[PDB]
Write a protein that binds this ligand. Structure first.
Ligand SMILES: *[C@@H]1O[C@H](CO)[C@@H](O)[C@H](O)[C@H]1NC(C)=O
Ligand SMILES: *[C@@H]1O[C@H](CO)[C@@H](O)[C@H](O)[C@H]1NC(C)=O
Ligand SMILES: *[C@@H]1O[C@H](CO)[C@@H](O)[C@H](O)[C@H]1NC(C)=O
Ligand SMILES: *[C@@H]1O[C@H](CO)[C@@H](O)[C@H](O)[C@H]1NC(C)=O
Ligand SMILES: *[C@@H]1O[C@H](CO)[C@@H](O)[C@H](O)[C@H]1NC(C)=O
Lengths: 49, 69, 20
């Protein structure tokens, strides 16, 4: 629900799509790489689980 | 997730899109500091209909507000 | 000064907008 904001201070809510968008932005791929294919990423994560 | 200008989706270079209820702003994630949405702080990519969460909104163009010489 | 230059055009999106 809050990513890592709860590890630094009070848990700050954020949509999970935007959380994963920033986490993509943290590995060197722009945000739009996730948004343009969000469904594919969600399906891949579900299949992996 | 993004702002839909005239047929194009605008994502923020750094920071998130937020609104006070009436107006939309770009702000850095770790400290609330609104900025008017511009083509400088937002990078365009893709189309207005590929991402879920689009909110139609104008994106300011600082290159020619007054520079229409 | 750099090894591996390739000649190519780099566009300036300012001038197509700047008609006046
Ligand atoms: C939101 O911010 C804009 C720009 O500062 C202002 O014009 C508007 O009145 C504000 N609305 C609210 C709900 O505070
Ligand atoms: C968010 O959820 C609300 C209610 O569940 C829904 O009406 C809306 O379409 C959803 N928006 C997005 C961006 O998923
Ligand atoms: C944005 O504008 C387009 C064209 O008028 C429309 O099809 C779309 O539903 C609008 N979306 C929102 C978020 O209002
Ligand atoms: C790569 O090596 C070739 C010779 O095999 C040389 O002609 C060329 O300039 C080199 N290019 C770069 C990028 O260093
Ligand atoms: C690029 O053009 C210059 C002349 O303007 C020439 O001297 C140079 O060798 C060219 N380099 C390549 C990669 O063709």
């Amino acid at each position: 629900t809050s990513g890592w904001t709860f590890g630094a201070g009070a848990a700050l809510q954020i949509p999970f799509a935007m959380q994963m968008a920033y986490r993509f932005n943290g590995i060197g791929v722009t945000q739009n790489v996730l948004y343009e294919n969000q469904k594919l990423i969600a399906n891949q994560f579900n299949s992996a689980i | 997730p993004a702002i839909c200008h005239d047929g194009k989706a605008h994502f923020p270079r750094e920071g998130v899109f937020v609104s006070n209820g009436t107006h939309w702003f770009v702000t850095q994630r770790n400290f609330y500091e609104p900025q008017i949405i511009t083509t400088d702080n937002t990078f365009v990519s893709g189309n207005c209909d590929v991402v879920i969460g689009i909110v139609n909104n104008t994106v300011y163009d600082p290159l020619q507000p007054e520079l229409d010489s």
